[PDB]
Design an enzyme around this catalytic site. Structure first.
Site, PDB file in Angstrom:
ATOM      1  N   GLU A 117      21.981  33.661  26.208  1.00 32.76           N
ATOM      2  CA  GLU A 117      21.615  32.403  25.566  1.00 32.76           C
ATOM      3  C   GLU A 117      21.023  31.418  26.567  1.00 32.76           C
ATOM      4  OE1 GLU A 117      24.648  29.736  24.607  1.00 32.76           O
ATOM      5  OE2 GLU A 117      23.725  28.981  22.761  1.00 32.76           O
TER       6      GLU A 117
ATOM      7  N   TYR B 226      17.292  23.059  21.997  1.00 34.54           N
ATOM      8  CA  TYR B 226      17.616  23.042  23.423  1.00 34.54           C
ATOM      9  C   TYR B 226      16.458  23.540  24.279  1.00 34.54           C
ATOM     10  CZ  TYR B 226      22.213  22.963  21.155  1.00 34.54           C
ATOM     11  OH  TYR B 226      23.286  22.671  20.339  1.00 34.54           O
TER      12      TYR B 226
ATOM     13  N   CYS C 271      24.357  20.201  20.148  1.00 34.12           N
ATOM     14  CA  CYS C 271      25.768  19.865  20.298  1.00 34.12           C
ATOM     15  C   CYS C 271      26.084  19.462  21.733  1.00 34.12           C
ATOM     16  CB  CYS C 271      26.631  21.043  19.853  1.00 34.12           C
ATOM     17  SG  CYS C 271      26.421  21.421  18.108  1.00 34.12           S
TER      18      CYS C 271
ATOM     19  N   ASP D 150      33.019  22.732  18.609  1.00 32.73           N
ATOM     20  CA  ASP D 150      33.811  23.764  17.944  1.00 32.73           C
ATOM     21  C   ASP D 150      34.752  24.347  18.987  1.00 32.73           C
ATOM     22  OD1 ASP D 150      34.877  25.908  16.522  1.00 32.73           O
ATOM     23  OD2 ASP D 150      32.975  26.418  15.563  1.00 32.73           O
TER      24      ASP D 150
ATOM     25  N   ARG E  47      28.462  16.131  22.018  1.00 27.38           N
ATOM     26  CA  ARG E  47      28.738  15.255  20.884  1.00 27.38           C
ATOM     27  C   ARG E  47      29.664  15.915  19.870  1.00 27.38           C
ATOM     28  NH1 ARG E  47      26.889  16.991  16.244  1.00 27.38           N
ATOM     29  NH2 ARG E  47      25.251  18.595  16.298  1.00 27.38           N
TER      30      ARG E  47
ATOM     31  N   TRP F 116      22.962  32.586  17.033  1.00 25.10           N
ATOM     32  CA  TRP F 116      22.086  31.607  16.409  1.00 25.10           C
ATOM     33  C   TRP F 116      21.386  32.149  15.170  1.00 25.10           C
ATOM     34  CZ3 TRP F 116      22.232  26.601  17.131  1.00 25.10           C
ATOM     35  CH2 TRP F 116      22.712  26.089  18.343  1.00 25.10           C
TER      36      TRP F 116
END
Ligand code: 2XB
Ligand code: 2XB
Ligand code: UMP
Ligand code: UMP
Lengths: 285, 285
Positions: free
Chosen positions: B59, B107, B167, B190, B187, B81
């Site tokens: 990733e 991103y 995130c 999970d 922000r 994703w």
């Protein structure tokens, strides 16, 4: 001149012999041919049919980067290697655990990492193998009279790992009177599809090296092994053979580039290319 | 060090509040958290559960490559994703004309091309926007004392075009005594699924930049905004909270890499990773 290619087409259609092949379609085959294309103030891009120039340029930059991943070339809009990199083609060769698009140790791997142990298309090979492309450029700069300025893509050790063994297997460079010339040995020539690509491809590579080494492009000698015309190309090529060839275009390099890795696709411009309409010809897989 | 993550899990289960969310499953939420993970001679890859390290590594290379295509990461065997890039998910956001896998300006786009106008996931953005990642590396090389070494993915202008807004929205780097430290403002966390990935992801990125700039990894400060535990993660996390943490593994980089774009997945090696059994947890889409 372009009439040499048309003469080779006419010779295969008139004197070629029927010959089976790895694919399903038969061929008209002739073994042993040679043509000399001038690179002086012109670029050998065929005019009797529109040649995919972006495919030639993007594929060569894809070779110089050392990539053997068809996804990287296909992302540039050039899908010529998608068939030989598809899942079904790799499975038919026994490459059941290889990722789709992994062509194996092919042109890009052998040019930059000859001798390195091939793992996969995503592996890091920096510092591994022989960098033939750069050693060619350095030998031209330091010893133009050398008779061993050769870049060879035929690796007998890596043959079982290739999805398609190199068709343009060996090329040699030659310098005299400040002219850079190139001869290519093509073991197998698809006269309808690959041969126009390959002629323009290695002429472009010679323009790149001559630009870096400060030499003037001279001749491109195209040597063929199995020069064959596929059966489903006989009627399309007979149409192309009736078209009057037009003068070759010119290749302009827009900026001074120091290293062959620094070349970008936006640095090249084909001027004066007025070809006949494109002739669609299917690929034999 | 890992006890900080487990302490946050226990703190949310004991003092978190019931809170609805964009998805269907509820959460136990706590606002405002911070943890400090040392990068000195260790790598914060959680031991209380086996973490998909290949997913973390692939990733980040997918982020550095600037890709916003979930298909490119999924082709590497990492489907994390795929859900937020599916056709039904994009349709639920009004992206009826978007191609499948196109997460929008996320991103990868914001790290390398902040400010450029986003077209689609396959468009060429080279030379467009601000290359935050490279400007971070260049600032570290030339001025380690700078207090503005920030890479921000939160682009308020591009928010309506994103399949999922970032995130991990902002990260800052810090250099003193030849040590490179990194702080991440997340922000939304999970705690069961994304947070263990994100912690190892930005620790790996700090190892990459320190390797490029010749610095030693220092601390990773993980700052959380909305730290939440999904309802369907309560029982899996209660099991993980009963496992005794084991020493962190180590991350070894196998070759000297000059540019961050040259990093490949083969260049990294996790040593001494002995995790507890894998704990399956469903993703809230
Ligand atoms: N039998 C066979 N013949 C070949 O020429 C190749 C090649 C190299 C190559 C060169 C050109 C093409 C090709 O489809 N060219 C097109 C351009 C448009 C396109 O990419 O669809 C054309 O001129 O009709 C495809 C492959 C790779 N593999 C090949 N196998
Ligand atoms: N609610 C929610 N939570 C998240 O963590 C995300 C993410 C990032 C992400 C991070 C990890 C996974 C994930 O499936 N991780 C697995 C790895 C194995 C797998 O592929 O299922 C795990 O660690 O158990 C999936 C998505 C993207 N979108 C997310 N939405
Ligand atoms: O650059 C290339 C790539 C492929 N081919 C053609 C030649 C053959 O028709 C076919 C490969 O078949 P084999 O000779 O490997 O069986 O591809 C070329 O001419 N040039
Ligand atoms: O790197 C990541 C990516 C996603 N998420 C989680 C946080 C949220 O639970 C969800 C995003 O949903 P919204 O906060 O936009 O509702 O994804 C993470 O924790 N880390």
């Amino acid at each position: 001149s372009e009439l040499q290619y048309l003469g080779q087409i006419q010779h295969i259609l008139r004197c070629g012999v029927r010959k089976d092949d790895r694919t399903g379609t038969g061929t008209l085959s002739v073994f042993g041919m040679q043509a000399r294309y001038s690179l002086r103030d012109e670029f050998p891009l065929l005019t009797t049919k529109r040649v995919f120039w972006k495919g030639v340029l993007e594929e060569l930059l894809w070779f110089i980067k050392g990539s053997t991943n068809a996804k990287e070339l296909s992302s540039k809009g050039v899908k010529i290697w998608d068939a030989n990199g598809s899942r079904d083609f790799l499975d038919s060769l026994g490459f059941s655990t290889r990722e789709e698009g992994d062509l194996g140790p092919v042109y890009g791997f052998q040019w930059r990492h000859f001798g390195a142990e091939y793992r996969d298309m995503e592996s890091d090979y920096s510092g591994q193998g022989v960098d033939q492309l750069q050693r060619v450029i350095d030998t031209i700069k330091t010893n133009p009279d050398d008779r061993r300025i050769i870049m060879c893509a035929w690796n007998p050790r890596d043959l079982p790992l290739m999805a398609l063994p190199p068709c343009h297997a060996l090329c040699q460079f030659y310098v005299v009177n400040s002219e850079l010339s190139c001869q290519l040995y093509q073991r197998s020539g698809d006269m309808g599809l690959g041969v126009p690509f390959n002629i323009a491809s290695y002429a472009l590579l010679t323009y790149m090296i001559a630009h870096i080494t400060g030499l003037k492009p001279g001749d491109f000698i195209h040597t063929l092994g199995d020069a064959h015309i596929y059966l489903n190309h006989i009627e399309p090529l007979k149409i192309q053979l009736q078209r009057e060839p037009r003068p070759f275009p010119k290749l302009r390099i827009l900026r001074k580039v120091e290293k062959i890795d620094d070349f970008k696709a936006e640095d090249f411009q084909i001027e004066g290319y007025n070809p006949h309409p494109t002739i669609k010809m299917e690929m034999a897989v």
